[PDB]
Structures are given as C-alpha cells and as structure tokens.
C-alpha cells in the first residue's frame, strides 16, 4: 500500500532501487532503511509482492507461508491472506509439488 | 532468529 513504505523496505541498507523515498526527490534514505527485527514480518510482506513481479512462484509461496505459520502474527489474518492470494492463484500453486511435511504443518 | 526472538522474550516476561 502506497509506495514510500514499499520503497524503503525493498531498497534495504544498500543503495538498491532508484525509487525516491517519500514525496521527496531524496535518494538519501534509499541507501538506508533495512526493515528488520520488529519490521521484519512487515518487510517480508512487501518483498512477497516484489517476488510476484520478478516472476517467482516458488519463493513467493514460501514467503506467504512463512508469515501464516508465525504465531505472533494475529489469528484473524488467516482467512485474509489465503482468501486474496492463495485462493485465486490456485493454478500456480497446483503446478508445484508439495510433500507430506509442508501439507501437515499448514 | 530476529522477529521470533524479540517477541518470545516479550511474552515470557509478560
């Protein structure tokens, strides 16, 4: 949601991305802001979005599951992540091969 | 591991 959040988490503590942060034309904090620790679960959601755009289905699924399993994310964000992301994109998932372990943990 | 660590200590105190 919007772009300055987006920008800042994905540019990390390296000068990556040319996308200016906030409504300012500054490149200054596009070489800083590596959403980590507390912002780590939040960082991982924005990155899951980057991965769809850079056409990964494998690493994309993986990031989405990681957050679903995390017991310190709310329980009420169950039906929300699966309904919007996993449910339409049923095909892409279906193509991929899932073992006994991944299925049982989910 | 980062996120788990910090929150896991936080519950234990609480």
- Joined together, the tokens standing for residue A71 give 């017991």
Please measure the distance between the N-terminal and C-terminal CA atoms of chain B and give it in whole angstroms.
20
Residue where the block lists tokens 């310190």: A72
Q: Cα separation of A78 and A67, whole Å?
A: 10
Experimental method reported for this structure: cryo-EM
Whether A41 and B6 lie within 8 Å, measured CB to CB: no
Question: A65, A83, A73, A18: which is closest to A40 by C-alpha?
Answer: A73
Q: Cα separation of A16 and A30, whole Å?
A: 7
CA distance A39 to chain B (A): 8
């Amino acid at each position: 949601l919007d772009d300055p959040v987006l920008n800042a988490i994905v540019s990390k503590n390296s000068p990556a991305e040319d996308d200016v942060i906030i409504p300012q034309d500054i490149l200054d904090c596009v070489v800083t802001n590596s959403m980590r620790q507390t912002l780590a679960p939040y960082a991982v959601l924005s990155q899951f979005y980057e991965l769809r755009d850079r056409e990964d289905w494998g690493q994309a699924l993986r990031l989405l599951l990681l957050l679903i399993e995390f017991p310190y994310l709310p329980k009420h964000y169950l039906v929300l992540l699966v309904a919007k992301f996993l449910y339409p994109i049923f095909l892409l998932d279906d193509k991929k091969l899932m073992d006994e372990d991944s299925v049982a943990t989910v | 591991f980062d996120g788990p660590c910090q929150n896991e200590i936080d519950l234990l105190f609480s």
